[PDB]
Symmetry: C3
Subunit: 261 residues, 3 copies
């Protein structure tokens, strides 16, 4: 049961509003290996998660201006595999909503299931498969809070098309030799890596990349009306048979200018 009341989000949000003059419209959640993205922020202000009332423990929240856009960034995220229920993993997203954030950018490291993928590739997330969600492990599980969103939110249009279009055209302006990949991200609980049988299984379900986060954050963001778009850094080609983080940082930085104000 969600151990957070509506007021808890509000308290946390007002705490942040009074401790920084920063008023972000964009929020970015970074997983593992994308910490250099926070060093590009100007007029930056960092808050350790441990100093923010109600924030899940263990990692920091960095406010600042990235390529002209005011944003708030999660340096380190939460995972189901660490033991947190999704209502803790996604706590920050609802706080962002209360801060006035309108767009959420999600990033993650993932295993490439699509044969055509190569290490270091950047896959624009066009869709996702939420396996934990099939069994009820859903961040929206429990009473619905109308002040956030509706009881039965649609997820088919989760990854904003306009931003995905900007992403492609922006990538083209970067003059990259490798095309910007695009595909379906499947989330699994973890923490162990998949077996061959499971890897094949996932590929046949239509997934292009596999990871252990993001989906719950996206679901909660869509529920509370945030515009969403994200990317997966293919850190390794998953083996289907028996026997670049810097570029992503630059890319997300450039996209700020393409996000509608």
């Amino acid at each position: 049961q969600n151990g957070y009341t509506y007021e808890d989000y509000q308290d946390t949000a007002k705490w942040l509003l009074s401790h920084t003059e920063q008023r972000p419209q964009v929020a970015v959640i970074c997983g593992s290996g994308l910490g250099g993205l926070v060093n590009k922020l100007t007029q930056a202000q960092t808050f350790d998660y441990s100093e923010i009332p109600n924030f899940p423990e263990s990692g920091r929240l960095v406010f600042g201006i990235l390529n002209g856009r005011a944003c708030v960034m999660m340096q380190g995220r939460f995972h189901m595999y660490e033991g947190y229920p999704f209502w803790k993993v996604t706590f920050p997203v609802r706080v962002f909503r209360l801060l006035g954030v309108e767009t959420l950018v999600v990033t993650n490291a993932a295993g490439g299931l699509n044969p055509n993928f190569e290490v270091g590739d950047i896959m624009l997330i066009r869709d996702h498969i939420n396996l934990p969600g099939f069994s009820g492990e859903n961040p929206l599980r429990g009473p619905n809070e109308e002040r956030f969103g509706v009881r039965f939110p649609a997820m088919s249009d989760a990854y904003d098309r306009d931003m995905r279009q900007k992403a492609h055209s922006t990538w083209k302006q970067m003059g990259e030799q490798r095309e910007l990949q695009e595909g379906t991200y499947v989330m699994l609980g973890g923490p162990n890596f998949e077996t061959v049988a499971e890897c094949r299984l996932l590929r046949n379900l239509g997934a292009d990349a596999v990871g252990m986060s993001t989906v719950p954050e996206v679901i909660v963001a869509r529920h509370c009306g945030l515009r969403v778009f994200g990317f997966s850094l293919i850190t390794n080609k998953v083996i289907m048979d028996y026997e670049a983080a810097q570029k992503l940082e630059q890319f997300v930085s450039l996209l700020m200018a393409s996000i509608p104000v």
Copy 2:
């Protein structure tokens, strides 16, 4: 852990037996949009769930005679997405068993995965896929109570063939232009609606319709020996690619006469 002792079911059952002279042999569980089915009951008696000891909160239980058959009807059901564990969602089924009920009729609103389905269609449930059940979210999870059923109940014959046969022949007597659909119902936790990738995934698993209930009720009913049959009201054709409630009420009403006594 099932927060109900065997005695809790018994207490609830005797409470109901002493508050109504009605002695139902058939139980009907209605989801959303099938409330007019309760208005067809004669010599009806309603109990709000809140006045019945032990009943899960938030909705009423209506006793009465439907087309000559004495039955008990759930107007409003419980869902995993609301936060209830399956032992609460399925609490009523075991109570029905203790009331002397022999047949359970389940109904639900569902999304059509089968391309040949049309809005308003009525799909006789021939089989189901219990996704939450694959991860252990099972209403039978925990110590087995032999006074109800066996430890490892078979589910392959869950939807009574004889009733499915009656359903088809009865539908034919109704002179309906649209054929009575038949297929596999897949249950997901919810509450968000599926993405395109998930919708395709489900269709490839062999599911004809998708919903957020019923399966746990059917499993518990089969476990305690109840005869089962049900229907899905296809309220919308699910989109598989990127870019009638009154009739059901009449149908279930007519089928009472086909249920063996």
Copy 3:
């Protein structure tokens, strides 16, 4: 949340080390119908689970020498369907590690999904599919204990190849008419048996046999560095459409001699 501290495993392990002179290098986990495997032990010593501090309740642990190899055997195992979280189901594996065990042999009764399987067949487990694991129901869920293993353990090489090779050559020396089967074991929560739609679904995921255990034990064993190999006794051919325990005991006994010392 894992209700066991590192010290709990240690306490249990030292308790056993001081109550028997036996110092096993191999551990065997037996499910249902493989109890005669314990009667082949010499210089045997039995401990009821109920007399071992910290051991999950309801079944015994038998130490002894099997075909020249000192081993510890679980006669009766734990299942998710009984209500235990995986940290209780897999408690013994970590204890074995602390006892100095290096190899874990897992056995189970399973339903045959592969059409070519026959009742009584013995399927060497080459790989597995962990459905509960896709939703987070993972024995490794929670903080990682480095004294056991790494945060993100690989599972693709879970079933030791060398032992699988020994298994085949050993089976050939047995002069059995039926070949030693080999395949992928898929674990589901249970306790109900699958429907036709689910059975087909599982087969299409690439599973050869279906059961309700083993996978969590294997995962924890691999996490703490144990060599693993196992077998599934096909007790029945699963019906895919709508309408030997003694040999296994002998086989596992013979394989002791093939396990590296």
